[model samples]
Target chain A: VEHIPFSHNHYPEKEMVKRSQEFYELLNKRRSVRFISNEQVPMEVIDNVIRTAGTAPSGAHTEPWTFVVVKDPDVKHKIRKIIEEEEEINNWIKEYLDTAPILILIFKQVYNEISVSIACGILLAALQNAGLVTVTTTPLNCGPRLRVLLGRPAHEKLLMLLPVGYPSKEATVPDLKRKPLDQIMVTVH
Target chain B: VEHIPFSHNHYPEKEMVKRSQEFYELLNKRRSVRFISNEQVPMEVIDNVIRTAGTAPSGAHTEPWTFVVVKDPDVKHKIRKIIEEEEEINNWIKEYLDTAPILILIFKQVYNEISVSIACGILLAALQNAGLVTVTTTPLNCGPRLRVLLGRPAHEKLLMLLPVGYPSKEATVPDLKRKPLDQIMVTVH
Candidate 1:
């Protein structure tokens, strides 16, 4: 691997924690919502959100990820047409199709699973940043039709179908809580 | 499947973007560094960082993830000896083991790939948020031995071996550039 004199930049240590702690709170408050409203988000907002994902480090710096924003009703309908019958998406997704202003279809080439997944989490936070609500939706099947229908290349793999818009007023999410820190972490000192 | 009245509290919509944009910058500054300093980070700082990883949303909120932080030199040495022998990590990983002060082994139960991956991504960002440097390291064909050596449960799958610490004074990262926003994103209007 070629190396260069990388001038590492960072804030002061105190500022670093304050900044990160704020970020922790930002993500801490973010919820993956299934209920979306039909409110239209500006294209500029979507642009910025997509830009955030592209900045993440990737496997071999190959940056093998594609974010396709589908707003065309006919195209969304075609997508729903196949994926709706996938059983996993059947009950939860029908309402999303009608209510969400856009559905972002995430695709990928051979990428480092760790780096790509981290970028995806940051992408979700970016969606919340854009005043949009979404649940990370992965199709159980329909991979064959998605490749042909979505105009993705043969090498690309379908990863997620994130429907995006504002949250609906009457929407109800699952009753859930994150695991306690004590349970999730261990220290070998 | 149960529903709850989602309070859906959030900062102002504009503020949400502000938070995420700053977060983007924080993560943007995070680079994979093999050069690590021996600076001792406070235990509280590591605790907060590990706590951040626990907040990621998981499948049905099962939260089937574990973060094990190792500071013991002997164990770290044993891990390094075996991992550096792995063909994928042979050339570069030796530097990381010697330089980094802490190594976190991430594990998870069988869960949906999308959610678990998203959480792992957040975990890396947390590492950065804590002002540390790391590259995501997953063992190749050595998980069974790692599980035995690390004394982890029988069921946990080894996800990553993240060597974490302050960057060394002379550290230099790969001279890499991420793909531009336009190249990585598309719109269907």
Candidate 2:
């Protein structure tokens, strides 16, 4: 283990510091939303949310990700079919489901094929923060099959299929449980 | 499209907002470090960083991810080999690399995987925030072979790997740029 002296460049001052703290709390308040209403969402809203997700950092500035906003009723229907199939399998195996309304497939581009299940976790939070309800569904053993059915491009991989919509009237989250701050933060003098 | 009034309940106010902004700015200042120094990092420090990354939100509250810290010189060296091999290929196939790092493998459980390429980026950022530097690396042909090499379980997928250490004197970053706020954010009334 090598010790590097701490250097603060582009450090935030008092006001900036105050503002940032607020932002984290805001983000922390974001939770996975399930049980969507049949209400329609505007294309612009979905577009903006995807743009926000793109702000996340990536390796080598590669920015290695893409957001495919499925709005066309036909495409959405195709996705719903694919996701419900996978979700049914997951539900059967896991024997339970979490309540999230929207499903946004997070595809991680690998070699030429994109894998959506790769990092759906982070992408889920990005969507949640954008004020949309989402439930992530993995393809399980049907990756290749789903690809063929959807006519997904060769370079595109299915990471996770996320269902996006408004939360149900009674959609609820599990009990809030997170590691304590002391356990999470480290201070080096 | 049926328009339902959309609003983010997670909006941060006052101090929490301030802190989050500070955290984001701090995170934004973080860069991938490739040149590691000979300095030894404390185990407690590494543990703390991992703890912070665990704070990241996950789908269905599954937490669906894990952090493996590598401080042992031997392990780091092994990781370097695997990563360098993959990186060489990436450089060779520059145009084909996607905007995001490819998924080399997935590890459902921790075991004796001794490659320096096993570090986690979320953990790496946490480490950097804890006053350390890290070099981010991706596995070559990162979909299947990398997974097989790690002996990762079929469920847990491997995303990007981070090489943790103090940055060398010559650590450098490419002249990358970020999109402007106007391009990145949309204010909804």
- Give lDDT tens digits, candidate 2, residues B1-189: 222333435332343334334444555556655455565555555545554455454534445544443334443444445555666742443211121111112233231121111124334434435555554444535535545544445554554555555555555655556555444322222
Judge the docking of candidate 2 as incorrect, acceptable, medium or high: incorrect
Candidate 1 CAPRI-style tier: medium
In model 1, which regions exceed 4 Å deviation? A9-13, A88-93, A111-115, A129-131, B8-21, B88-93
lDDT digits (tens) for residues A1-189 of candidate 2: 243433434322343334334334544555544456655555445554454344445544445554544445555555555556765742333211222222355445552221112223334443444455664455535655655655555655655555676666655665566655443332222
lDDT score of model 1?
Answer: 0.73
Clashes (candidate 1): 1
**Per-candidate TM-score against the hidden true structure:** 0.90, 0.53
Q: What count of clashes does model 2 give?
A: 65
TM-score of chain B of each: 0.88, 0.64
Query: After best superposition, candidate 1 residue B117: deviation in angstroms?
Result: 2.1
